[PDB]
Amino acid sequence: IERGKFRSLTLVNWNGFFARTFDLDELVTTLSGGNGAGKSTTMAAFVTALIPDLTLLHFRNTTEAGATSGSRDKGLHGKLRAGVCYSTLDVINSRHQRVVVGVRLQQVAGRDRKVDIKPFMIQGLPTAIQPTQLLTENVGERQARVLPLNELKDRLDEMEGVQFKQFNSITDYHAQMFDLGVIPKRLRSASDRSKFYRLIEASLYGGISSAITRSLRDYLLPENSGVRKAFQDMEAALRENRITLE
Amino acid sequence: LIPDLTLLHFRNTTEAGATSGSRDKGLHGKLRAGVCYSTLDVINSRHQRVVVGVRLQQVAGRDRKVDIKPFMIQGLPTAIQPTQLLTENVGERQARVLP
Amino acid sequence: SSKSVANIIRKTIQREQNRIRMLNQGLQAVSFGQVRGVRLNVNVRESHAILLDVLSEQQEQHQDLFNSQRLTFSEAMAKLYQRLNPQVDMGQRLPQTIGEELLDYRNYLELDVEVNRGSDGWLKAESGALSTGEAIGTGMSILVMVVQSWEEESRRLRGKDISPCRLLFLDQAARLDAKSIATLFELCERLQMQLIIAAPENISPEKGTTYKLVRKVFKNHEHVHVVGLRGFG
Amino acid sequence: EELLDYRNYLELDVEVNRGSDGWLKAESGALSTGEAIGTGMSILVMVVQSWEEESRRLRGKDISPCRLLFLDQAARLDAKSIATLFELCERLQMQLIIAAPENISPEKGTTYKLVRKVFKNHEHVHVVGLRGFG
Amino acid sequence: SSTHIEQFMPVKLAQALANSLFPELDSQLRAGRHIGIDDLDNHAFLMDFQEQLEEFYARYNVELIRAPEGFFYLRPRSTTLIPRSVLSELDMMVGKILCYLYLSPERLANQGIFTSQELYEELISLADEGKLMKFVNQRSSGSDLDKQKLQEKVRTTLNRLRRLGMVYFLPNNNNKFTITEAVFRFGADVRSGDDPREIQLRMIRDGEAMPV
Amino acid sequence: FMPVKLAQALANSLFPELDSQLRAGRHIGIDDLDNHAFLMDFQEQLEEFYARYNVELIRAPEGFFYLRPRSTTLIPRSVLSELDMMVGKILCYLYLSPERLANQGIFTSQELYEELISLADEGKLMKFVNQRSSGSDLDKQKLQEKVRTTLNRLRRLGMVYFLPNNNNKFTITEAVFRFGADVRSGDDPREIQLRMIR
Amino acid sequence: ELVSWARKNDFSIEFSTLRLSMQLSIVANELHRAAEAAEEGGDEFHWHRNVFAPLKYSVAEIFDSIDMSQRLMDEQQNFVKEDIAALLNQDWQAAIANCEQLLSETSGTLRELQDTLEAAGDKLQANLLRIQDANMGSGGSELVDKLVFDLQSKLDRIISWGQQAIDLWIGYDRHVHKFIRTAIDMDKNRIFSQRLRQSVQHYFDNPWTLTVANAERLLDMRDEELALRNEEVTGELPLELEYEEFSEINDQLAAMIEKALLVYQQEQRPLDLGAVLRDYLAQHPLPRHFDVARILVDQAVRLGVAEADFSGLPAEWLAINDYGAKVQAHVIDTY
Amino acid sequence: ISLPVERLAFLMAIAVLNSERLDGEMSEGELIDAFREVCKGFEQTAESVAVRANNAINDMVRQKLLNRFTSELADGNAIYRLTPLGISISDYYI
DNA sequence: ATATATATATATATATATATATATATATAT
DNA sequence: ATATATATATATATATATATATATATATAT
Ligand SMILES: Nc1ncnc2c1ncn2[C@@H]1O[C@H](COP(=O)(O)OP(=O)(O)OP(=O)(O)O)[C@@H](O)[C@H]1O
Numbered sequence A: 001i002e003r004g005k006f007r008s009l010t011l012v013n014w015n016g017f018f019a020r021t022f023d024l025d026e027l028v029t030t031l032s033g034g035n036g037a038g039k040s041t042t043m044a045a046f047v048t049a050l051i052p053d054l055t056l057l058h059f060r061n062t063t064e065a066g067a068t069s070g071s072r073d074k075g076l077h078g079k080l081r082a083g084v085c086y087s088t089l090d091v092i093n094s095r096h097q098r099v100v101v102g103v104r105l106q107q108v109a110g111r112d113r114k115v116d117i118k119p120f121m122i123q124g125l126p127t128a129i130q131p132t133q134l135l136t137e138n139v140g141e142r143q144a145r146v147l148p149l150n151e152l153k154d155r156l157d158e159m160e161g162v163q164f165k166q167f168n169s170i171t172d173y174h175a176q177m178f179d180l181g182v183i184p185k186r187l188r189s190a191s192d193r194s195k196f197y198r199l200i201e202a203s204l205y206g207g208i209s210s211a212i213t214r215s216l217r218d219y220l221l222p223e224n225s226g227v228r229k230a231f232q233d234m235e236a237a238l239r240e241n242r243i244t245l246e
Numbered sequence B: 001l002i003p004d005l006t007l008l009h010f011r012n013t014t015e016a017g018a019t020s021g022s023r024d025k026g027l028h029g030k031l032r033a034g035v036c037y038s039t040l041d042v043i044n045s046r047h048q049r050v051v052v053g054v055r056l057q058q059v060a061g062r063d064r065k066v067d068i069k070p071f072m073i074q075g076l077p078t079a080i081q082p083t084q085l086l087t088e089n090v091g092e093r094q095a096r097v098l099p
Numbered sequence C: 001s002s003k004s005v006a007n008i009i010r011k012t013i014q015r016e017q018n019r020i021r022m023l024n025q026g027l028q029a030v031s032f033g034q035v036r037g038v039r040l041n042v043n044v045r046e047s048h049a050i051l052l053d054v055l056s057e058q059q060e061q062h063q064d065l066f067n068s069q070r071l072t073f074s075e076a077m078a079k080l081y082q083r084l085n086p087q088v089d090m091g092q093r094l095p096q097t098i099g100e101e102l103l104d105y106r107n108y109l110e111l112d113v114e115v116n117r118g119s120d121g122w123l124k125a126e127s128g129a130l131s132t133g134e135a136i137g138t139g140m141s142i143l144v145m146v147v148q149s150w151e152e153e154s155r156r157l158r159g160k161d162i163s164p165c166r167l168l169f170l171d172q173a174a175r176l177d178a179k180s181i182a183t184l185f186e187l188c189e190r191l192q193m194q195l196i197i198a199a200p201e202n203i204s205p206e207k208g209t210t211y212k213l214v215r216k217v218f219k220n221h222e223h224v225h226v227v228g229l230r231g232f233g
Numbered sequence D: 001e002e003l004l005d006y007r008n009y010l011e012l013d014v015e016v017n018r019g020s021d022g023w024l025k026a027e028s029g030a031l032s033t034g035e036a037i038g039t040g041m042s043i044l045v046m047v048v049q050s051w052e053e054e055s056r057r058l059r060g061k062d063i064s065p066c067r068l069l070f071l072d073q074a075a076r077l078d079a080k081s082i083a084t085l086f087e088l089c090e091r092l093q094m095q096l097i098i099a100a101p102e103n104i105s106p107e108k109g110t111t112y113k114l115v116r117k118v119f120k121n122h123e124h125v126h127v128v129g130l131r132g133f134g
Numbered sequence E: 001s002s003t004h005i006e007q008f009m010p011v012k013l014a015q016a017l018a019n020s021l022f023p024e025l026d027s028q029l030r031a032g033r034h035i036g037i038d039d040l041d042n043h044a045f046l047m048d049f050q051e052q053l054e055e056f057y058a059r060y061n062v063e064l065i066r067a068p069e070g071f072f073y074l075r076p077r078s079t080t081l082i083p084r085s086v087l088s089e090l091d092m093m094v095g096k097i098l099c100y101l102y103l104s105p106e107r108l109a110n111q112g113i114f115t116s117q118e119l120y121e122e123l124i125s126l127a128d129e130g131k132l133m134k135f136v137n138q139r140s141s142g143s144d145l146d147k148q149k150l151q152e153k154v155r156t157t158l159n160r161l162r163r164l165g166m167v168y169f170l171p172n173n174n175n176k177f178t179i180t181e182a183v184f185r186f187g188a189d190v191r192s193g194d195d196p197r198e199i200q201l202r203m204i205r206d207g208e209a210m211p212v
Numbered sequence F: 001f002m003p004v005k006l007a008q009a010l011a012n013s014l015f016p017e018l019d020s021q022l023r024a025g026r027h028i029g030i031d032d033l034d035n036h037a038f039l040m041d042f043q044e045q046l047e048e049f050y051a052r053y054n055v056e057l058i059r060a061p062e063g064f065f066y067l068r069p070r071s072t073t074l075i076p077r078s079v080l081s082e083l084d085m086m087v088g089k090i091l092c093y094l095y096l097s098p099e100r101l102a103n104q105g106i107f108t109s110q111e112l113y114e115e116l117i118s119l120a121d122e123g124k125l126m127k128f129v130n131q132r133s134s135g136s137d138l139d140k141q142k143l144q145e146k147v148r149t150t151l152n153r154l155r156r157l158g159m160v161y162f163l164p165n166n167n168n169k170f171t172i173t174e175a176v177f178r179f180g181a182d183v184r185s186g187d188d189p190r191e192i193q194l195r196m197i198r
Numbered sequence G: 001e002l003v004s005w006a007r008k009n010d011f012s013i014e015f016s017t018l019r020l021s022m023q024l025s026i027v028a029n030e031l032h033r034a035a036e037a038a039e040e041g042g043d044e045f046h047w048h049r050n051v052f053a054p055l056k057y058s059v060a061e062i063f064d065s066i067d068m069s070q071r072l073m074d075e076q077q078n079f080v081k082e083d084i085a086a087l088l089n090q091d092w093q094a095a096i097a098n099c100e101q102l103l104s105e106t107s108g109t110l111r112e113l114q115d116t117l118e119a120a121g122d123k124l125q126a127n128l129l130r131i132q133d134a135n136m137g138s139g140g141s142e143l144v145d146k147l148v149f150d151l152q153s154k155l156d157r158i159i160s161w162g163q164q165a166i167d168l169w170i171g172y173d174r175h176v177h178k179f180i181r182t183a184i185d186m187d188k189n190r191i192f193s194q195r196l197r198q199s200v201q202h203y204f205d206n207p208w209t210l211t212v213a214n215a216e217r218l219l220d221m222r223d224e225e226l227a228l229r230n231e232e233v234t235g236e237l238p239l240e241l242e243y244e245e246f247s248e249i250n251d252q253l254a255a256m257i258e259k260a261l262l263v264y265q266q267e268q269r270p271l272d273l274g275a276v277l278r279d280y281l282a283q284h285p286l287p288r289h290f291d292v293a294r295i296l297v298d299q300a301v302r303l304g305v306a307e308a309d310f311s312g313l314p315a316e317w318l319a320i321n322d323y324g325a326k327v328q329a330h331v332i333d334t335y
Numbered sequence H: 001i002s003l004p005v006e007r008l009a010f011l012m013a014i015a016v017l018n019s020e021r022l023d024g025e026m027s028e029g030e031l032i033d034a035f036r037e038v039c040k041g042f043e044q045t046a047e048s049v050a051v052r053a054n055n056a057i058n059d060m061v062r063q064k065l066l067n068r069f070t071s072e073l074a075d076g077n078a079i080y081r082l083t084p085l086g087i088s089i090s091d092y093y094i
Numbered sequence I, J: 001a002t003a004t005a006t007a008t009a010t011a012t013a014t015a016t017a018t019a020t021a022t023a024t025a026t027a028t029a030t
């Protein structure tokens, strides 16, 4: 079988990036540049596109990886510019379907460095349409402008064959992505989402993540309900015996 | 520099501030069986050549523990190197570290 | 009921041991520093095997502990685990939580990561006794095995026609040398794993695609300029 | 007792003039790896200088304590940052021991090439040394 | 002597009010929640210090009352310091039906676990379908849209009763439930073998039930 | 056991009414002489008693007491509408200094209605009544009725003391400062209040 | 995947324990015979006719028959529940004894079925493991393993149900007693039940409602409405990606040095880094010298070790050029 | 006995899962999932998934196709098992 | 005149309980 | 039909108590 692939990553109105699309590689994509180039920003934007759960997203420095820094800030807000921003993934499914998943990010006005995230998906987009252009409107002389979610919905609905969906919960977002062969595990419960984010977070910083090795049992071995049922049966028996004894 | 077993913790660069996870401090496995030495040579502003150092020994036992004994040497000639003081150039192929 | 419990735990443990032992042969002697191979050690814990035996055959002998109004079932299990096998010397953790932990079958197996460091055989992998590159390689091996296991488990729910996408990251790749990076590349391609790596210097000039980013201050704001790179010219 | 200490009366912060923006409080989460490493080294040399200044009055007037710092996994820094760090250490007469897995080749100072091997069924580190280049 | 609890409060009442269970129980009770045998901890707590709590709550002009079935609750007086409210007539229908299901052996196979659909089927079996529907909408004549409206209304009333402790949703399922003995209160007008019109006056006089 | 002074405070015959009004969210100011003095005296123990409920007994800088529910509050919580906070800020503004010459501490529903219409933006007014409305008689009547309802809701909280009669004319208490903004050195209270409201 | 198969198909429209014992005996005989035949061994045709035709069909059919008996018992449990439920409607207080008997007989029957099931489960499992052991006698016996893996679960599955059903029934039973202890104890004559029914039927002739405490909810301050940042950001769109190429000069230099140095390994000549570096650096301009030295060392240290490094005698810093370049390395002797 | 295409497909899926089920027990928590999957495959939405699933399970129970047992601990607080008629109808094609 | 055992102080890090913030389901009301 | 309020669960960081192991000075056996 032909495994699906991540074609490209698009960044809109990000810190440093206005509208930039990196075409990913079949095997390895490398990013270089002096300190502060913005590679970590690209990684963060990708992972935000993958797991938009705001509770999990925490972009600590590679130094103090997992060491509590008490900054009170997850670091995502400072990585976005004012206004609308987008982070999208084009994926070729094993069914050879081009699906553009993505999220609209937006800073929340106020002293708190808080952000709002709204996921979305597009199916059936023609292979000739690039997300960078799809998400921007050419206004002025070579001066494209970004358009909000409502405008994007209007633009896409006017097209033929493209199906756009907007999710009210990251749960359905993950469910749809899993349905299209994008995620290995079905993140039905919040614990599954936490484990998934733990895996990608350990990968990003690389190496032996303390939490992983500490819960390797939970991460590898599957949960069994028969043992739980048997223990509950024994619990009920013991409770009845105690009732009788008392 | 700091021969204190309480503070010495050679955790991996990764997990630079994370909890221990294990109980070992990572020093014992960096030593070899026998008597070992770690020495600095310093030239003061007064230009006194001082050899500070510590003798290390893997404390034989159930756990992976290390014994450290500090020491200082003053007035050494500038022509004698630390490796010579601590090692006997016996006729064998390899020298012998002396206690 | 206690006998039936112990039996089902034993069967589940045996099945999981067999599955993991079969999976272990999915590794092909990765070369990272002095680490020559990575392996998963699964073993039933004797401290817990004794507990299973007591539950399955000698439940009544310790009823005095079970039927105490002071102890809940989790606390009763914890106290029983304390009674037999008293040399484990658990820490300051409370009886309630340790019992609750005892109620999960997975706990009964020691599940650890072994590495064939140099020529010392297979040793338990402790971050405190491994170089940075060795630990990074071992962690990547663990993560790839975990994702493989997740894919395998979901093979039933998913359709027969879809293979989920595979992708991982590695920031500050400069911590790895050429040999380690070549080994990582060969592993990822053998496992059809996509990788996104970062390093200040182009550490992988002759494989995959590469980009270089330069940040320019420009009229009191910033812009990132991206330039593709090619192996030869 | 906390009030009895004058130091508690003081608020201390670390600020960086980051790019086009003014001075911002140094938050580990709002910086890249190299920036954080460099700021850490800066604060470390600040601490060393402060300690020397404090201890001078209890020492011989002609004693200057040695200053020496480390930097492991230096490959996380670019050439520009490494050059700036070298300039800083030189200006402060401060010795550095930097580890890099062959990625960087600092031309100034001493370099030590290490290679691990098996000899007589024992692990051995073959060591070679160079210096004076530049 | 001074600095002595008996000066202000009896020892047992103070001990009861300082117990870890007191706050949740008090908040639930003031919210209108009935307490049955199922909440073993709370029921035992009420039983042990039952008298102290009736006299404490009397200060609010509300009676902590234990029905003969063994379930405690609060009945406010006309001079209540805690506001008072009356269940809807549809709530009475569902409560009477719930009592029937508690006492009905035909559904014994269910083992106490019931679904809202079965409750609605039984309700329509025993009540007047269209004339009961009249209250859901004044212009109903059997329209299936109004039928779904009545089903939704029954579901909502069932949820409110769940809030009152008459019914418990299952630890994982909100579409199935288990009845509690508190439902017996819905039969207080018929537990005594006398004329209905005199028992109604007795109850309303006692504050048990206001009219509509 | 129980703290002795806590037992004394709970046993006091004032405790039932005050407890009911607190659990109802009412704010106890300096006007309620007996209740305010009781709370002043026994705060050190009622704070613990109401912290047992995962609620905080807060004495505002103005002086009035109230209960703030935490996320784990054991007292069924509820949230005021948008119109409720808007009306609260309107009254806080009306707790003004020229107010003394304007209404001498006694306002009427018409004052609040006119202030709300003139001061608030049209979009929020429509959001209150309904989006599709645009300057109509029925919509304005419904808005006035909702204004009366929220005024009653505030009365329940002790924010507004009605002058006793069916007619709508009341007085504003100091506790209304809860809706108010913080005061800085030299800031005009009018300006900061209006900036918050806008 | 079967959903599409069904869609295209377009289709639409004995509790006696003596039995269970006799099927178990038949199964025991056939399973033991098949296990012994497998253990004896034979060619591919013998393996087939002894372990695939006889075993497969017979064991599948008779395990299905045993499961069918369990299903018939399930039907009987359902029927007895319904009979109890109907009886309690007709006699109320007088059916208590009837229901207790029916519960007794059903419980006894379930226990006897469980006993009969466990009477042969262990030995059948042993025989099946024996067949597993003997299966590996040929390479084409893969299919046999499937049965030896399949016929396991069914058996155990059967036994599981034999207990699970009781676990369920012993539960349900209790409820019935509870009902009798709760529903009918306080309604011995049932009059309360009829009177409640008539009240329900004629409720609205006297509509009455109960009173319940409805304490007020603690009104709270609404958190400030969250307003996002909107600025209609605009900017230049990136051009087409440019490209740059990597210089392989260092690769060429490394190849040159490796070829120049392989002679030392070939001849096992003692290599002295000082002299070699001093000679070789003369061929390049000074600025490149460093980039040469490093590479040369990288090439040299892979070739054997230096024996003097174990002598405890530090080596000297030999100069390898003008301008002040120095090297510290012992002679490389042991190749 | 009346099995439309959707009901028949749900029954066949139930039989397949029971065949591949470890201990031969089916909680309704999985029956609802199976009905959701079959209805999704058949691409028809007369009502919500839950109501359709409940109606189909009840119809099969009363049509003598499934047997229900009340067990609170079970996922969905119920355990379902194929009846002899259901087994026969399922294996007639399988 | 020595080295081991004791008591003291200290940092480490282990665990618990608390409090906060976010996501979810879902039940109400226009 | 959908905006909105409400209850619940989980992850995450803070703060405190406590057991463990080591370092230092003194006491007492060798
Ligand atoms: N949340 C933030 N707030 C403010 N500035 C930020 C934020 N995140 C990143 N930056 C700045 O953006 C630039 C790029 O940061 P980033 O961490 O993405 O770079 P990088 O390429 O990964 O760097 P390095 O390789 O040195 O770690 C740096 O100036 C960093 O300080």
Ligand SMILES: [Mg+2]
Residues within 6 Å of the ligand: A036, A038, A039, A040, A041, C171, D032, D033
């Ligand atoms: Mg970075």
